[PDB]
Amino acid sequence: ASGEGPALYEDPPDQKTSPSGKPATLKICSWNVDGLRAWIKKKGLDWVKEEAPDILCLQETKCSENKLPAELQELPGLSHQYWSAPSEGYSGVGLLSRQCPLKVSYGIGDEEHDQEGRVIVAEFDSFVLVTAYVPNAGRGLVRLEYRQRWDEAFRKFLKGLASRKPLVLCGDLNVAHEEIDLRNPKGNKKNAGFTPQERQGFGELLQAVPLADSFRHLYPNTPYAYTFWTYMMNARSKNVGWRLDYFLLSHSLLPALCDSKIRSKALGSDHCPITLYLAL
Ligand SMILES: O=C(O)c1cc2cc([N+](=O)[O-])ccc2[nH]1
């Protein structure tokens, strides 16, 4: 018999100025859409239009780069579009920007980890943005050994990128770092997204690059702030969720951090969007 009832979470108002008072100049939105076509049918684009981000990162598009829905043409102000998908119907990431990036790359430079369309790297003047859909550990943890290999290769790759330019990593990292990051830590310690191996990998990623978890850095003691809820058992209406989607930043970008938002009420997927405001 289920132990959780509703838990309130009200994302605070958008702080659009840096701690020094500098207005935000860049708004990035990241969203695991759980199928680009399904998300469009569920009015996901109408939400993007209201949010009006400068850069939109999408994960789990499940769409081949050569089968993109024609409705994507109804997104003005995000004309530079980049997509990665497996060598259709699984994984897939997208990055849509108002301004053209200096360079766009796909993957993490390792053949073993570059066949499932999980990563886009876009270099800009002041920083390099990476969007990722991290491999899920799987039912029965059958992909956990592979996920640990992925974590090490990704950490090495990001540390290399950060040594040249400040980094922003966003996306569905498929781990709730700490107990405060999910509604049911006790029942999920042996499930994908909350194994000690995955949590330890997330801690290693923050320490080694290094990177700061933008949301937790700003709201260190705030509970019930999630970005994913299973479609089953009315989990979203009870706020039985997990915070799997993040914006991780280089320490040098902390003075530029205005806010890191969780758009809780935005429908269209089993994940909600997250939004970052930077004063670059
Ligand atoms: O590196 C930077 O300082 C920077 C890149 C960038 C891109 C957009 N955009 O609209 O795609 C807006 C503001 C931006 N700032």
Coordinates of C-alpha atoms and ligand atoms in Angstrom, one line a residue:
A1 CA 0.0 0.0 0.0
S2 CA 1.6 3.2 -1.3
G3 CA 3.3 5.4 1.3
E4 CA 3.4 8.8 -0.5
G5 CA 0.7 11.4 -0.9
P6 CA 1.1 14.8 -2.5
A7 CA 4.1 17.0 -1.5
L8 CA 4.1 20.6 -2.5
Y9 CA 6.8 22.2 -4.6
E10 CA 6.6 25.8 -5.9
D11 CA 9.6 26.8 -8.0
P12 CA 10.6 30.3 -6.8
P13 CA 10.3 33.4 -9.1
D14 CA 12.9 33.8 -11.8
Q15 CA 16.0 35.6 -10.6
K16 CA 17.1 37.3 -13.8
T17 CA 20.1 39.2 -12.4
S18 CA 23.5 37.8 -11.3
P19 CA 24.6 38.3 -7.6
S20 CA 26.4 41.5 -8.7
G21 CA 23.3 42.9 -10.4
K22 CA 24.2 42.0 -14.0
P23 CA 21.1 41.1 -16.1
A24 CA 20.9 37.7 -17.7
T25 CA 22.0 37.7 -21.3
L26 CA 21.4 34.0 -22.1
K27 CA 18.4 31.7 -21.3
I28 CA 18.9 28.0 -22.0
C29 CA 16.1 25.5 -21.7
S30 CA 16.6 21.7 -21.5
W31 CA 13.8 19.1 -21.8
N32 CA 13.7 15.3 -22.1
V33 CA 10.7 15.2 -24.5
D34 CA 10.2 11.4 -24.4
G35 CA 9.5 11.3 -28.1
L36 CA 9.6 14.4 -30.3
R37 CA 6.4 13.5 -32.2
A38 CA 4.5 12.6 -29.0
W39 CA 5.7 15.8 -27.3
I40 CA 4.7 18.0 -30.3
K41 CA 1.2 16.3 -30.2
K42 CA 1.0 17.2 -26.5
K43 CA 1.6 20.9 -27.2
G44 CA 5.3 21.0 -26.3
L45 CA 6.2 23.6 -28.9
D46 CA 3.5 26.0 -27.6
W47 CA 5.3 25.9 -24.2
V48 CA 8.8 26.6 -25.9
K49 CA 7.2 29.6 -27.5
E50 CA 6.1 31.0 -24.1
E51 CA 9.5 30.3 -22.5
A52 CA 11.3 31.9 -25.5
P53 CA 14.8 30.5 -24.7
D54 CA 17.9 31.6 -26.6
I55 CA 19.0 27.9 -26.7
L56 CA 16.8 24.8 -26.4
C57 CA 18.3 21.4 -25.7
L58 CA 16.2 18.3 -26.1
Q59 CA 16.8 14.7 -25.0
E60 CA 15.1 11.3 -25.9
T61 CA 13.9 12.8 -29.3
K62 CA 13.5 9.2 -30.5
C63 CA 13.7 10.7 -34.0
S64 CA 16.2 10.2 -36.8
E65 CA 17.9 13.3 -38.1
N66 CA 16.4 12.5 -41.5
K67 CA 12.8 12.0 -40.2
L68 CA 12.3 15.3 -38.2
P69 CA 8.6 16.4 -37.9
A70 CA 7.7 19.3 -40.2
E71 CA 6.0 21.1 -37.2
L72 CA 9.6 22.0 -36.0
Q73 CA 9.4 24.8 -38.6
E74 CA 6.9 26.6 -36.3
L75 CA 9.8 27.5 -34.0
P76 CA 11.1 30.9 -35.0
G77 CA 14.1 32.4 -33.3
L78 CA 15.7 28.9 -33.0
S79 CA 16.8 28.5 -36.6
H80 CA 20.2 26.9 -36.0
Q81 CA 19.2 23.2 -35.4
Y82 CA 21.4 20.2 -34.7
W83 CA 20.4 16.7 -34.1
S84 CA 22.0 13.4 -33.2
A85 CA 20.4 10.0 -33.2
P86 CA 21.5 6.3 -33.2
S87 CA 23.3 4.7 -36.1
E88 CA 15.2 5.3 -35.0
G89 CA 12.9 5.2 -32.0
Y90 CA 15.4 5.5 -29.1
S91 CA 17.7 8.0 -27.5
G92 CA 18.4 11.1 -29.7
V93 CA 19.3 14.6 -28.7
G94 CA 18.7 18.0 -30.2
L95 CA 20.1 21.5 -29.8
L96 CA 18.3 24.6 -31.3
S97 CA 19.8 28.1 -31.0
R98 CA 19.0 31.7 -32.0
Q99 CA 22.7 32.4 -32.7
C100 CA 25.0 30.2 -34.8
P101 CA 27.6 28.2 -32.7
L102 CA 31.3 28.5 -33.5
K103 CA 31.5 24.7 -33.8
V104 CA 29.1 21.7 -33.3
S105 CA 30.4 18.2 -32.5
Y106 CA 28.7 14.9 -31.8
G107 CA 29.6 12.4 -29.2
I108 CA 32.5 12.2 -26.7
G109 CA 35.4 11.1 -29.0
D110 CA 35.1 7.4 -28.1
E111 CA 33.6 4.9 -30.6
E112 CA 32.2 2.6 -27.9
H113 CA 30.0 5.5 -26.5
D114 CA 29.2 7.4 -29.7
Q115 CA 26.7 5.0 -31.4
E116 CA 23.5 6.0 -29.7
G117 CA 23.1 9.7 -30.4
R118 CA 23.4 10.9 -26.8
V119 CA 25.7 14.0 -27.0
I120 CA 25.9 17.4 -28.8
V121 CA 28.7 19.8 -28.1
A122 CA 28.2 23.4 -29.2
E123 CA 31.0 25.9 -28.7
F124 CA 30.2 29.6 -28.3
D125 CA 32.3 32.7 -27.6
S126 CA 32.4 32.5 -23.8
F127 CA 31.6 28.9 -23.1
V128 CA 31.0 25.4 -24.4
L129 CA 27.5 23.9 -24.0
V130 CA 27.1 20.1 -23.9
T131 CA 23.7 18.4 -24.0
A132 CA 23.4 14.8 -23.0
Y133 CA 21.0 11.9 -22.6
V134 CA 23.1 9.6 -20.3
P135 CA 22.6 5.8 -20.7
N136 CA 20.0 4.4 -18.3
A137 CA 21.2 1.5 -16.1
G138 CA 18.3 -0.6 -17.3
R139 CA 15.7 -2.9 -15.9
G140 CA 17.4 -5.3 -13.5
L141 CA 20.5 -3.1 -13.8
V142 CA 21.6 -5.1 -16.9
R143 CA 23.3 -1.9 -18.3
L144 CA 25.0 -0.8 -15.0
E145 CA 28.5 -2.1 -15.9
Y146 CA 28.2 -0.3 -19.3
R147 CA 26.9 2.9 -17.5
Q148 CA 30.0 2.9 -15.3
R149 CA 32.2 2.8 -18.4
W150 CA 30.2 5.6 -19.9
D151 CA 30.5 7.7 -16.7
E152 CA 34.3 7.4 -16.7
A153 CA 34.7 8.2 -20.4
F154 CA 32.3 11.1 -20.2
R155 CA 34.0 12.6 -17.1
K156 CA 37.4 12.3 -18.9
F157 CA 35.9 14.0 -22.0
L158 CA 34.3 16.9 -20.0
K159 CA 37.5 17.5 -18.0
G160 CA 39.3 18.0 -21.3
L161 CA 36.7 20.4 -22.6
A162 CA 36.7 22.4 -19.3
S163 CA 40.6 22.8 -19.5
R164 CA 40.1 25.1 -22.5
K165 CA 36.8 26.9 -22.0
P166 CA 34.1 27.3 -19.3
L167 CA 31.5 24.5 -19.6
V168 CA 27.7 24.2 -19.2
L169 CA 26.5 20.5 -19.2
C170 CA 22.7 20.0 -19.4
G171 CA 20.3 17.2 -19.9
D172 CA 19.0 14.0 -18.5
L173 CA 21.9 12.6 -16.5
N174 CA 19.9 9.6 -15.3
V175 CA 20.8 9.8 -11.7
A176 CA 19.2 11.4 -8.6
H177 CA 22.4 12.5 -6.8
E178 CA 21.2 12.5 -3.2
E179 CA 18.2 11.4 -1.1
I180 CA 16.7 14.9 -1.4
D181 CA 16.7 14.4 -5.2
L182 CA 13.9 11.8 -5.2
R183 CA 10.7 11.1 -3.3
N184 CA 11.5 7.5 -2.4
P185 CA 15.2 7.0 -1.7
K186 CA 14.6 3.8 0.4
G187 CA 12.6 1.9 -2.2
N188 CA 14.9 2.8 -5.1
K189 CA 18.5 2.1 -3.8
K190 CA 18.6 -1.0 -6.1
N191 CA 16.9 0.6 -9.1
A192 CA 18.3 2.5 -12.1
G193 CA 18.9 6.2 -11.3
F194 CA 19.7 5.7 -7.6
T195 CA 22.3 2.9 -7.3
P196 CA 25.4 3.7 -5.2
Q197 CA 27.4 3.3 -8.5
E198 CA 25.4 5.9 -10.3
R199 CA 25.4 8.4 -7.3
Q200 CA 29.2 7.9 -6.8
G201 CA 29.7 8.6 -10.5
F202 CA 27.8 11.8 -10.2
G203 CA 29.9 12.9 -7.3
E204 CA 33.0 12.1 -9.2
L205 CA 31.8 14.2 -12.2
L206 CA 31.3 17.2 -9.9
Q207 CA 34.7 16.8 -8.2
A208 CA 36.9 15.9 -11.2
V209 CA 35.9 18.4 -14.0
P210 CA 35.0 20.3 -11.6
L211 CA 31.4 21.2 -12.0
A212 CA 28.7 22.7 -9.7
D213 CA 25.0 21.5 -9.7
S214 CA 23.4 24.9 -10.5
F215 CA 20.0 24.1 -8.9
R216 CA 21.4 22.5 -5.7
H217 CA 24.0 25.3 -5.4
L218 CA 21.3 27.9 -5.3
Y219 CA 18.7 25.8 -3.3
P220 CA 20.8 23.5 -1.1
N221 CA 18.0 22.5 1.4
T222 CA 15.0 22.5 -0.9
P223 CA 13.1 19.2 -1.0
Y224 CA 10.4 17.8 -3.4
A225 CA 12.0 19.5 -6.5
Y226 CA 11.9 16.9 -9.2
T227 CA 12.0 16.8 -13.0
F228 CA 10.7 13.3 -13.8
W229 CA 7.7 11.4 -12.7
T230 CA 6.7 7.9 -14.0
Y231 CA 3.6 7.9 -16.2
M232 CA 2.3 5.1 -13.9
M233 CA 0.3 5.3 -10.5
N234 CA -0.6 9.1 -10.8
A235 CA 3.0 9.8 -9.7
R236 CA 3.1 13.3 -11.1
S237 CA -0.2 14.4 -9.3
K238 CA 1.4 13.2 -6.0
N239 CA 4.9 14.6 -6.8
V240 CA 6.5 11.1 -6.5
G241 CA 9.4 12.1 -8.7
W242 CA 13.2 12.2 -9.3
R243 CA 15.5 15.1 -10.2
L244 CA 17.3 13.6 -13.2
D245 CA 17.7 16.7 -15.3
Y246 CA 20.5 19.2 -14.5
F247 CA 22.5 22.2 -15.5
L248 CA 26.1 21.6 -14.3
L249 CA 28.5 24.6 -14.6
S250 CA 32.2 25.2 -14.4
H251 CA 33.1 27.1 -11.2
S252 CA 34.3 30.1 -13.3
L253 CA 30.6 30.5 -14.5
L254 CA 29.2 30.7 -10.9
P255 CA 29.5 34.6 -10.9
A256 CA 27.4 34.6 -14.1
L257 CA 24.7 32.3 -12.6
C258 CA 21.3 34.1 -12.2
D259 CA 19.0 31.2 -11.6
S260 CA 18.3 27.5 -12.4
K261 CA 14.6 26.7 -12.7
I262 CA 12.4 23.6 -12.7
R263 CA 9.3 24.3 -14.8
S264 CA 7.1 21.9 -12.8
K265 CA 3.7 22.6 -14.4
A266 CA 4.9 22.3 -18.1
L267 CA 3.2 19.3 -19.6
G268 CA 4.1 17.2 -22.7
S269 CA 6.5 14.5 -21.3
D270 CA 7.2 12.4 -18.2
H271 CA 10.0 15.0 -17.6
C272 CA 9.4 18.7 -17.1
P273 CA 11.7 21.4 -18.6
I274 CA 14.6 23.1 -16.7
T275 CA 15.8 26.6 -17.5
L276 CA 19.1 28.3 -16.8
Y277 CA 19.7 32.1 -16.8
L278 CA 23.3 33.3 -17.2
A279 CA 24.8 36.8 -17.2
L280 CA 27.6 36.4 -19.8
Ligands
LIG1 O1 29.0 32.8 -25.4 C1 28.2 33.7 -25.1 O2 28.5 34.7 -24.4 C2 26.8 33.6 -25.7 C3 26.4 32.7 -26.7 C4 25.0 33.0 -26.9 C5 24.0 32.5 -27.7 C6 22.7 33.1 -27.7 N1 21.7 32.7 -28.6 O3 20.8 33.3 -28.8 O4 21.8 31.5 -29.3 C7 22.5 34.2 -26.9 C8 23.5 34.7 -26.1 C9 24.7 34.1 -26.1 N2 25.8 34.4 -25.4

